[PDB]
């Protein structure tokens, strides 16, 4: 699809995420050309779940404790498509506020940003 | 233009930014679908300008100190265009880390994401 850019209506799509840790879930995600890497909420993961620590640069500076990194790939299915996007690794939000589809994943969909 | 998305290569543009408080300046700015408003480095404003308070939600949580809002509109010209994007107001980065062209500016270029 073509997704129009609007300050008052975020470009969000529904997305099935498979964390390999528990059954795949549907989330609502922001397509974000300014995210290096994909972000999915910790709530998608089982409690027995080992995650690596990591630095993320955000709007208000570098955060040490807010994001974690997966050890396993994460597969993401977009609406009406059978082939997953597979990310080697991705970011995890401990506060459960960000579900972000970043350029790692849009590269795989062959997504583009188009300026008339 | 069609910008391909790629995790190792930020999608950046050269933009002329007019604070109406010092001479216009051409800066490199991140093209960013995940931003509700544009962000401009405090360095581009006369150190003598009034700026309103505001709260922004970033990857590391809400911040109330880091971004101000502009008192005056901001004009932004992109490569090869006489006619400016006009922003009623926008965010100002107090630490000069970021120049981000956000959904406000991109609506006025009528940019779209496209997912094949």
């Amino acid at each position: 699809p073509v997704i129009p850019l609007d300050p008052a209506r975020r470009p969000v799509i529904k997305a099935q995420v498979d964390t390999q840790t528990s059954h795949p879930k549907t989330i609502e995600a922001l397509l974000d050309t300014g995210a290096d890497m994909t972000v999915i909420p910790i709530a998608l993961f089982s409690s027995n779940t080992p995650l690596k620590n990591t630095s993320v640069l955000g709007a208000g500076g570098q955060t040490q404790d807010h994001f974690k990194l997966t050890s396993l790939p994460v597969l993401i299915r977009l609406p009406f498509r059978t082939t997953p996007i597979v990310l080697t690794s991705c970011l995890v939000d401990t506060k459960n506020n960000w579900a972000i589809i970043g350029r790692d994943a849009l590269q795989q969909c062959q997504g583009v940003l188009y300026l008339p | 233009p069609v910008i391909p998305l790629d995790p190792a290569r930020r999608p950046v543009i050269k933009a002329q930014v007019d604070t109406q408080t010092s001479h216009p300046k051409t800066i490199e700015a991140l093209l960013d679908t995940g931003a509700d408003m544009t962000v401009i480095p405090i360095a581009l404003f006369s150190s003598n300008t009034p700026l309103k308070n505001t709260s922004v939600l970033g990857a590391g949580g809400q911040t109330q100190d880091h971004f101000k809002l502009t008192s005056l509109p901001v004009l932004i010209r992109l490569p090869f265009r006489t006619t400016p994007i006009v922003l009623t107001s926008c965010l100002v980065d107090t630490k000069n880390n970021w120049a981000i062209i956000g959904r406000d500016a991109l609506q006025q270029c009528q940019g779209v994401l496209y997912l094949p």
Partner: peptide
């Protein structure tokens, strides 16, 4: 770090 970019209120 990787960068992740901005929301209102």
């Amino acid at each position: 770090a990787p960068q992740v970019x901005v929301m209102h209120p």
